[PDB]
Write a protein that binds this ligand. Structure first.
Ligand SMILES: C[C@H]1CNC(=O)c2[nH]c3ccc(C(=O)Nc4nc(C(=O)NCCN(C)C)cs4)cc3c21
Length: 291
């Protein structure tokens, strides 16, 4: 009668040199805020891991903490251990994470081909990451395609959300959610980035791009501010006008008009991914030709 499974363990930070437990190669797997990710090896199991190197301070401390909490979610990259060591005398935190070999979301899409129903199933999985986060009052605030790596190159490899460098915390019965903690509008710009990734998912380019010799509001940044974009053919010719209408509710200019991660997930095109059009999509050839 009690949520036993709801007790997860809080972080125990190892303070011995991480070079007892891992070989640490000089080779970089990626780059993220505050940290380069080197590839390391467990010295005992010889298994292969990702190491991010932050330098101690309330930013660093905050990433480890927030991220440790989100580590439980299946769709967020799993933390193996966190070490607090002395790196040349200056003190820093070391995050050891699982490895993700499937590449970025888009790279592992840019070779085949990709259909709507398949993008819907993909958009759902990112949504679960985002819906878990907001349910524990964390906003990621840098959800981009480069923060999305696949575990393996198997067809059954998971899509996982990396990097908590910019992630931030957001804090009777008929009481209203305002009173129960004001909560800014941070979860909001995850919802925006979800649209941007939904948009780039279906056609193969971003809704906002660089072009200056035109008519009204040239700036890459003015098009963002105004909310000036739309869905060209052919790329969008046959794309569900239900789906376009969904992308209209995340790419709202006004943060208060956007769709909440819950509304997003309950919304049909996501929820029932397994009963949307299986119709073709230009992504694979669009995203390939351009580059
Ligand atoms: C992303 C980078 C951005 N920010 C993060 O906080 C972050 N956390 C991560 C955890 C695991 C991996 C990971 O699994 N990386 C891997 N990368 C490769 C790889 O093949 N890299 C090649 C890149 N190089 C040739 C330029 C294999 S596994 C990358 C991460 C990143």
């Amino acid at each position: 009668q009690f949520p036993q499974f709801h007790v997860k363990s809080g972080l125990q930070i190892k303070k011995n040199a991480i070079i007892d437990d891992y070989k640490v190669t000089s080779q970089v797997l990626g780059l993220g805020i505050n940290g380069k990710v080197l590839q390391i090896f467990n010295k005992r199991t010889q298994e292969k891991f990702a190491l991010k190197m932050l330098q101690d301070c309330p930013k660093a401390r905050r990433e480890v903490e927030l991220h440790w909490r989100a580590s439980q979610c299946p769709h967020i990259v799993r933390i193996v251990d966190v070490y607090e060591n002395l790196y040349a005398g200056r003190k820093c935190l070391l995050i050891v994470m699982e490895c993700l070999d499937g590449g970025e979301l888009f790279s592992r899409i840019q070779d085949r081909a990709f259909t709507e129903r398949e993008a819907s199933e993909i958009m759902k999985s990112i949504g679960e990451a985002i819906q878990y986060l907001h349910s524990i009052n964390i906003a990621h605030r840098d959800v981009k395609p480069e923060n999305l790596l696949y575990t393996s190159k198997r067809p059954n490899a998971i899509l996982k959300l990396t990097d908590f460098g910019f992630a931030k915390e957001t804090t009777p019965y008929y009481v209203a959610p305002e009173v129960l903690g004001p909560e800014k509008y941070d979860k909001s710009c995850d919802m925006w980035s979800l649209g941007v990734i939904m948009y780039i998912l279906l056609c193969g380019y971003p809704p906002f791009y660089s072009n200056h010799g035109l008519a009204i509001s040239p700036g890459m940044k003015t098009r963002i501010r105004m909310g000036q974009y739309e869905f060209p053919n052919p790329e969008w010719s046959e794309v569900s006008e239900e789906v376009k209408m969904l992308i209209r509710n995340l790419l709202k200019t006004e943060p208060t008009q956007r769709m909440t991660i819950t509304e997003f997930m309950n919304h049909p095109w996501i929820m029932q991914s397994t009963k949307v059009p299986q119709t073709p999509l230009h992504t694979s050839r669009v995203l390939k030709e351009d580059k």
